[PDB]
Amino acid sequence: ETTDGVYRVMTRRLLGSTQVGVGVMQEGVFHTMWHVTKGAALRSGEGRLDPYWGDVKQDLVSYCGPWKLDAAWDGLSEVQLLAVPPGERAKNIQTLPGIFKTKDGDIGAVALDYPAGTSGSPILDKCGRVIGLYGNGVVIKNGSYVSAITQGK
Amino acid sequence: DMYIERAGDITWEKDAEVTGNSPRLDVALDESGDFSLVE
Lengths: 153, 39
What we know:
The complex is a heterodimer. By secondary structure, chain A is mainly β. Chain A folds into two domains: 1-69, no CATH class; 70-153, no CATH class. Helices cover 3% and strands 47% of the residues of chain A. Chain A has one helix and 15 strands; from the N terminus they run βββαββββββββββββ. In chain A, the strands form four sheets. In chain A, strands 1-2-3-7-6 form a five-stranded antiparallel β-sheet. In chain A, β2 (18-26) and β3 form a beta hairpin. Chain A starts with a strand and ends in a 5-residue tail after the last strand. Chain B is mainly β. Chain B has strands at residues 2-8, 17-18, 24-29, 35-37. At the A-B interface, β1, β2, α1, β4 and β9 of A face β1, β2, β3 and β4 of B. β4 of chain A pairs parallel with β1 of chain B. The PDB classes it as viral protein. Keywords: Viral protease, Protease inhibitor complex, viral protein. It forms a dimeric assembly.
């Protein structure tokens, strides 16, 4: 299935069928985070998806083609995390992102804590454009999880 | 073998639950893509 939208990344190698992450299908390219697939190939029905580009530091990987997601957080408006937890239905969660302040610039961050099956969930702007992926971040002194809004180029 | 299955559309829902606060953190990113607090 090459139908644009968000997908679950499942594996039938552990116990039963486990959900290891989430991905986005857009312009015939599947986008997810590196730590989810570790560059491994993906099966979509009878067809096979081969890795095309990846970067461990960015924790991103694309299949079937180059990174296609270009939207970025405007730094002001609220966003929606389309969280796809394993075994549960996709739910849109609205929030105002924080900021990751690094030596190479600032990156948006969302203070939403979700299970391990959720890495790769897309983060959307008001116009439905994917501005990043959820699943790579930090836990702060209180124990709350804060994920960076990881977007490619 | 890993495989993918569709989960839904990428669309903004007008009446979505709003939660999560908005922290500003100083972080560092290592070569292995891991984030770390700097202060």
